[PDB]
Design an enzyme around this catalytic site. Sequence first.
Site, mmCIF file in Angstrom:
data_model
loop_
_atom_site.group_PDB
_atom_site.id
_atom_site.type_symbol
_atom_site.label_atom_id
_atom_site.label_comp_id
_atom_site.label_asym_id
_atom_site.label_seq_id
_atom_site.Cartn_x
_atom_site.Cartn_y
_atom_site.Cartn_z
ATOM 1 N N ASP A 117 -86.419 -28.302 -35.887
ATOM 2 C CA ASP A 117 -87.731 -27.619 -35.806
ATOM 3 C C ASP A 117 -88.647 -28.107 -36.926
ATOM 4 O OD1 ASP A 117 -89.749 -25.658 -35.731
ATOM 5 O OD2 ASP A 117 -88.399 -24.042 -36.430
ATOM 6 N N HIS A 147 -86.685 -28.809 -46.366
ATOM 7 C CA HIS A 147 -87.029 -29.996 -45.578
ATOM 8 C C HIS A 147 -87.683 -31.077 -46.450
ATOM 9 C CE1 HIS A 147 -86.257 -29.897 -41.455
ATOM 10 N NE2 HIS A 147 -86.577 -28.610 -41.423
ATOM 11 N N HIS A 170 -82.140 -30.579 -42.000
ATOM 12 C CA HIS A 170 -80.831 -30.416 -41.400
ATOM 13 C C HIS A 170 -80.363 -31.843 -41.193
ATOM 14 C CE1 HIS A 170 -81.708 -26.160 -40.420
ATOM 15 N NE2 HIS A 170 -82.859 -26.511 -39.812
ATOM 16 N N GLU A 199 -78.661 -31.893 -34.463
ATOM 17 C CA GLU A 199 -79.255 -30.656 -33.931
ATOM 18 C C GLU A 199 -79.645 -30.905 -32.472
ATOM 19 O OE1 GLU A 199 -82.045 -28.141 -35.965
ATOM 20 O OE2 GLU A 199 -82.482 -27.040 -34.087
ATOM 21 N N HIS A 234 -80.594 -28.277 -30.241
ATOM 22 C CA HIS A 234 -81.109 -26.945 -29.911
ATOM 23 C C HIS A 234 -81.655 -26.801 -28.489
ATOM 24 C CE1 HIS A 234 -83.044 -23.263 -32.246
ATOM 25 N NE2 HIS A 234 -82.630 -22.877 -30.993
ATOM 26 N N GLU A 246 -77.786 -25.705 -35.203
ATOM 27 C CA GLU A 246 -78.191 -25.283 -33.836
ATOM 28 C C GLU A 246 -77.815 -26.263 -32.717
ATOM 29 O OE1 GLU A 246 -82.375 -24.406 -35.096
ATOM 30 O OE2 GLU A 246 -81.828 -22.235 -34.752
ATOM 31 N N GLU A 274 -79.472 -19.131 -43.318
ATOM 32 C CA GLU A 274 -80.911 -18.869 -43.237
ATOM 33 C C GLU A 274 -81.165 -17.378 -43.177
ATOM 34 O OE1 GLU A 274 -81.034 -22.480 -39.938
ATOM 35 O OE2 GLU A 274 -82.864 -21.288 -39.896
ATOM 36 N N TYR A 275 -82.121 -16.939 -43.950
ATOM 37 C CA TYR A 275 -82.540 -15.547 -43.939
ATOM 38 C C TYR A 275 -83.911 -15.454 -44.581
ATOM 39 C CZ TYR A 275 -81.686 -14.664 -49.075
ATOM 40 O OH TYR A 275 -81.741 -14.664 -50.479
ATOM 41 N N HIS A 282 -87.064 -14.992 -43.277
ATOM 42 C CA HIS A 282 -87.977 -16.039 -42.763
ATOM 43 C C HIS A 282 -89.366 -15.825 -43.376
ATOM 44 C CE1 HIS A 282 -90.045 -18.176 -39.349
ATOM 45 N NE2 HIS A 282 -89.024 -19.023 -39.546
ATOM 46 N N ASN A 337 -96.593 -27.711 -28.002
ATOM 47 C CA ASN A 337 -96.324 -27.498 -29.425
ATOM 48 C C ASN A 337 -96.050 -26.018 -29.705
ATOM 49 O OD1 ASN A 337 -98.830 -25.886 -30.828
ATOM 50 N ND2 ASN A 337 -99.813 -27.336 -29.396
ATOM 51 N N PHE A 396 -95.472 -22.123 -36.215
ATOM 52 C CA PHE A 396 -94.035 -21.993 -36.484
ATOM 53 C C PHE A 396 -93.428 -22.987 -37.483
ATOM 54 C CE2 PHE A 396 -92.366 -18.031 -34.871
ATOM 55 C CZ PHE A 396 -93.444 -17.544 -34.111
ATOM 56 N N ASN A 414 -93.261 -21.918 -42.645
ATOM 57 C CA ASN A 414 -92.370 -20.800 -42.923
ATOM 58 C C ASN A 414 -91.956 -20.737 -44.381
ATOM 59 O OD1 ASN A 414 -90.338 -22.143 -40.161
ATOM 60 N ND2 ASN A 414 -92.174 -20.847 -39.931
ATOM 61 N N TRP A 447 -89.656 -13.386 -35.114
ATOM 62 C CA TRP A 447 -89.882 -13.484 -33.684
ATOM 63 C C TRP A 447 -89.428 -12.219 -32.991
ATOM 64 C CZ3 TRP A 447 -87.640 -16.962 -36.836
ATOM 65 C CH2 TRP A 447 -86.255 -16.969 -36.912
HETATM 66 C C1 LIG Z 1 -83.342 -21.706 -38.594
HETATM 67 C C2 LIG Z 1 -83.367 -23.182 -38.187
HETATM 68 C C3 LIG Z 1 -84.646 -23.856 -38.725
HETATM 69 O O1 LIG Z 1 -84.558 -25.198 -38.296
HETATM 70 C C4 LIG Z 1 -85.935 -23.147 -38.245
HETATM 71 O O2 LIG Z 1 -86.004 -23.329 -36.823
HETATM 72 C C5 LIG Z 1 -85.791 -21.589 -38.527
HETATM 73 C C6 LIG Z 1 -86.873 -20.728 -37.848
HETATM 74 O O3 LIG Z 1 -88.215 -21.043 -38.354
HETATM 75 O O4 LIG Z 1 -84.528 -21.074 -38.037
HETATM 76 MG MG LIG Z 2 -83.683 -25.445 -34.175
HETATM 77 NA NA NA Z 3 -89.949 -22.923 -37.979
#
Ligand SMILES: *[C@@H]1C[C@@H](O)[C@@H](O)[C@@H](CO)O1
Ligand SMILES: [Mg+2]
Ligand code: NA
Lengths: 1011, 204, 193
Positions: free
Chosen positions: A189, A345, A379, A404, A406, A449, A525-526, A528, A585, A589, A592, A987
């Site tokens: 993402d 990232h 990731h 990934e 997803h 994911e 992850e927590y 957000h 798109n 999002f 974050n 979300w």
């Molecule tokens: C955890 C995974 C990360 O890549 C983002 O997609 C996040 C949500 O913004 O979730």
């Molecule tokens: Mg993802």
């Molecule tokens: Na995101």
Amino acid sequence: RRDWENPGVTQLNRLAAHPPFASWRNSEEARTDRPSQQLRSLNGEWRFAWFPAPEAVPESWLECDLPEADTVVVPSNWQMHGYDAPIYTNVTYPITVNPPFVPTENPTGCYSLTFNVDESWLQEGQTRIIFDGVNSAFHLWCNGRWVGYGQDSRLPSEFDLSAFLRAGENRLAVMVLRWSDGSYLEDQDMWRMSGIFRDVSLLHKPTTQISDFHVATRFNDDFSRAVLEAEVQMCGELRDYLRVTVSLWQGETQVASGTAPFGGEIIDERGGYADRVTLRLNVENPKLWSAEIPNLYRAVVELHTADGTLIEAEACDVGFREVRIENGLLLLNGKPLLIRGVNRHEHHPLHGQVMDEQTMVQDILLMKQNNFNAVRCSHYPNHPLWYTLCDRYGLYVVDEANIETHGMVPMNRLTDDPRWLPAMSERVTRMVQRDRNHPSVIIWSLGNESGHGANHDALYRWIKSVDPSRPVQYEGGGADTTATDIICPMYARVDEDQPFPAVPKWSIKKWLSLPGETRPLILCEYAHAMGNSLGGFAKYWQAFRQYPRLQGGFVWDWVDQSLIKYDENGNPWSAYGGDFGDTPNDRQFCMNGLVFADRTPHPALTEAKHQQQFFQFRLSGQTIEVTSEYLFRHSDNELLHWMVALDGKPLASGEVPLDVAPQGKQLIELPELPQPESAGQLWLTVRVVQPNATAWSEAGHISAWQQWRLAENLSVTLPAASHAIPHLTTSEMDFCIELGNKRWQFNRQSGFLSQMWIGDKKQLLTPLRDQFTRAPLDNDIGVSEATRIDPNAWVERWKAAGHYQAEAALLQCTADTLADAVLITTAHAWQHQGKTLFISRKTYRIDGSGQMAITVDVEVASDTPHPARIGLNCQLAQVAERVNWLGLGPQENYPDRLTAACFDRWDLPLSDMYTPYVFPSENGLRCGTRELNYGPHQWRGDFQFNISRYSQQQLMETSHRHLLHAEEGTWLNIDGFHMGIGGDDSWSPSVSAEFQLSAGRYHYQLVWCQK
Amino acid sequence: DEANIETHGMVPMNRLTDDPRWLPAMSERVTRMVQRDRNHPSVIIWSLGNESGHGANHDALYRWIKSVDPSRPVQYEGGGADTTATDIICPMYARVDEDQPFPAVPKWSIKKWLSLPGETRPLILCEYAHAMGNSLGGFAKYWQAFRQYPRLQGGFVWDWVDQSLIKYDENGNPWSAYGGDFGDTPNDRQFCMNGLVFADRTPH
Amino acid sequence: RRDWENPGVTQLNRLAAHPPFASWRNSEEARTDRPSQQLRSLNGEWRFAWFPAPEAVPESWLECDLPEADTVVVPSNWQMHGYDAPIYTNVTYPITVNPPFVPTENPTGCYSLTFNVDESWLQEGQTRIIFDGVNSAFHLWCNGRWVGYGQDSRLPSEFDLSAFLRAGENRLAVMVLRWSDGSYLEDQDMWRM
Ligand SMILES: *[C@@H]1C[C@@H](O)[C@@H](O)[C@@H](CO)O1
Ligand SMILES: [Mg+2]
Ligand code: NA
Ligand SMILES: *[C@@H]1C[C@@H](O)[C@@H](O)[C@@H](CO)O1
Ligand SMILES: [Mg+2]
Ligand SMILES: [Mg+2]
Ligand SMILES: [Mg+2]
Ligand code: NA
Ligand code: NA
Ligand code: NA
Ligand code: NA
Ligand code: NA
């Protein structure tokens, strides 16, 4: 061949992966980590032409430059040069899902370089080229002759050019495909870009060389003794005279050294490895590595001949540390960690995915300064330098394979398939082969994911088998599968379960004790942090400290992935999903983070820092108990500072050096608190200050704080006799009150204070009216879209209820004269489609002193969704330079995100009262405020407020901050109560019940007067 | 049912199996077998191959199967006959009472092998009682031990049929030939003939 | 490409593996395991020619029978037909140990077959070819056009010939390599064929 649509071909002619090499030919340079004459960067000016598909590339290009090409900087992502649009899609694949195929129209980047090569590199040895990062797949030609092919945009791909080069001028030809079968495993993402975005270099090695080396450190029981074991492999012809010396250094002191010829121990019936050797060095009392004190030694591995002639030397930094999971707890050097982590990232607002050391250092320092001690490489494997820095600065790192998927349905469609095993495997094995010697990596990650498939179980085991030194973790498939040593969910709540079928997210507290569960849980992850978020952060911090097996987590995430765009006037603005014509798109999002793309922090960052403090405090009487959460170091660079103030006014303060051992406690008695003359509340604030600069902070750095209310003295002091009596002027349409040169007008049909004058100057632009909604936050919105409403999102519930459409119907408007005051009484209903949603009842008592006392009592239908706020609002006619207040600050703070804020007297420029979130929404609130000053006005009470040039209406009609325009005057929102902002995820509704305005009946009171 | 993976000739034996670059080729020999044969009730155990040392590729593969088909145990004798890549102690040629303590990969007496500290798996020889020529001397001793010890669950004799091939003399009459009889060199002469039955199925 | 010298390439265009199938179009037959008209055997007489190295193979072969070829039964091992010697080596690799390379003189077996396909098979559906055992690697062509590649001498290699056959007479050409990087994984104590 279309090798790019065949996961069975991930590369051709690529050499084996290995740890960072430089081929020094002088041992002291290797010892000192100095630049190596045998390792050259080809970064710089290259030739580039964009094509719409590989098929459109002319054969000519292989032997000569295409006139039409341009000169551009490498590394880079070609989208950042404008050749094509970067795409921001979250889950949905940017290409049709039809594996292993890709679109016929496949943007092709043709890069080329004419460069020199010295004869000395060719007359002997091996010369290879190293592409640290190529997104997503590429063919390489050298002097018009085909070399090889590489996949995996996140690990270096190396090729032997020895036979292709000639002394002098040479030509490289690189055809980079935007999409490949590899993209199927690169569905993270983030923006989807392409090109040669990480370093390009030439490395020369001798034909008889060090082809790989593994460094292991094992310890005795209390870590007072260690064995450094270095397994070394060579390539070339074996000869009895060859030797390997491995030496260990602590600064300039040579700690140990061992020499030996090649020939390893017997492995099986066939013998052992004649081309390897393991040196063993004993180290007494090693200085241990940790994020707290990142002590490192230096290992130098020399390949030489028996007479002492050096062939070459490789080297690495070594950190003595042991990582293990024992009895359900993740230990470091035998102590359980508490991960204050963050996902990060590789993102730069101008350069896209190209990483520079400056930005890296910037990030590491902010991180440390903000109490983070750990990072997750979301990731994919990171640019090599990242690891050196983490090793040296001290961050615990989760290294993650570039996997990934997803976008598949179900998510494990590719991971459970044995035909994708090979491709996935290399994503894991080559990561390990590259990074296994960095002490900062303490945990391996299988990627992200990708559901949970059998390939994951196979890959999990390979690792455990080849590197028992670090735990393996993986979130897919439910977060607690057989492919993970750690319960590592994403967005699991502290107390509330989310029993999704097949992959529920249990309350973390509850997940630990599920029948048969014994592992450690650290969230991958927590919290957000999209927009105005981090609501409920403290709740995570409180459960982590209470539950031994709750070992922390990784905040999602560090920095907003916004890109810089330029307006027609040439000014830059921050862009998100869709801002490049990319569709489909996922809009905002990609934003974050705790900090903006440019590194400026969001208000949330400070909440993070405070909750992740390493010192805990308790107060008892005049006693302050300070507890250290450090596991290894003593508080050797800390002083405790304290201060007592009555309503913002300093009464006393002082200092005491802290001297607390890791996990120890220290008592500090405060000196007797001289009584205080006058009403008000005493407040105690303490601060932990580092007098001395460090590698990651400046002298004076504040690392922790806490406040406590102390005694309060209520005012019982009877006011004083008004010099005057306000007069009421009653008219058909208005109730007017006049006092001195002040006037107030209350309109009889509206029922609101519509004008206030100071002299003949009007003070309002819009009447003072109740306000029950807010410009929705990212969290309120969730995934709802006009194109696709999410009826459960907060914003959708408010809409549908008519909250934003509801209009004030007057029920009552009276005026009465009292002994020394004029009393106005009003009652208004807010309805929608015949339903009464809110009822507001107020009094306005204007007295002899010119103070306007406002009392507000509100009723909220029980069946309507809980409102965002219950306050008043108005547009002031004036604009002022500063905002002074008595309350929580100095930064923006909300009910569920106010721990870091301190109660005190703050004073800021008006602009600092607005938070420039890229995607605008309600912002700039300050809570627990007892007094607010603006221009000649002062408001007193117990409220929450925000003050700015932008109305809530504008904010909510505006999608990009750069498009906002200051309005006339100043917009003032003063709330008796404001809803929490949430953020457990962005979300789904995430505001905790305790932060919802559900009481049904609300009361607040305010005093508006002049100063 | 055993994967077609044998790299006995490498030095050391696991040179390729411990090499990730070889994980893919290897994986397909293991995953393709399972995909094809997993519905046959007669298949009761999966084997990772033969004489290819013990490599990390083996552990990975072992796990994959364990994951995809938990209905059957996984065995593999390489690297010691009792590594982490086998559900069964499955040595080749371990003796009844006699230990053969070779380094790294000792061949313990079978009876002794089962009770080594911490050992609990069943033991079934993947290969024993080498029937080459006039052999099988001491056969009853294995049977006696298998009957007396619950965890000695038998074994697979080496082997069924001589790999001898037919050739014709000048007179055109047939004869049994072995290694070297075709001009093949180097060769291992009669080692290809270790069966309980002759190449035409007549019993030894 | 020298696909046979790269453990990174074990097949090309090969179909997924699966349990035995026969695509019966009658449920009672499937019950009783009776032969299926959808599953045809290609066994019997083929044309085979032997070469010392893949480089010695003439192009002509791809589209046309080599007059020099012999007619031989398939399945078979070519050593058993006398085209070359079978080798009995136990542990020592029958080829020089230099992964993933193999000898440049590498016995090459050129098999081909002309056979008929009924329109019915081509009007609808999918027609695949299944080679249950080919030792040790091979390239396949159909009607002169290249189809795929495969290794692992002991599992079925399957390819979709749907897009390559035509009603009536068709020609398959299979170039079989004795040695390949797969030979590295095939060092069993038995005759090398
Ligand atoms: C955890 C995974 C990360 O890549 C983002 O997609 C996040 C949500 O913004 O979730
Ligand atoms: Mg993802
Ligand atoms: Na995101
Ligand atoms: C076990 C392995 C098998 O293939 C043969 O080598 C046997 C001895 O003849 O030992
Ligand atoms: Mg590919
Ligand atoms: Mg191959
Ligand atoms: Mg063998
Ligand atoms: Na804890
Ligand atoms: Na101190
Ligand atoms: Na907005
Ligand atoms: Na028994
Ligand atoms: Na034998």
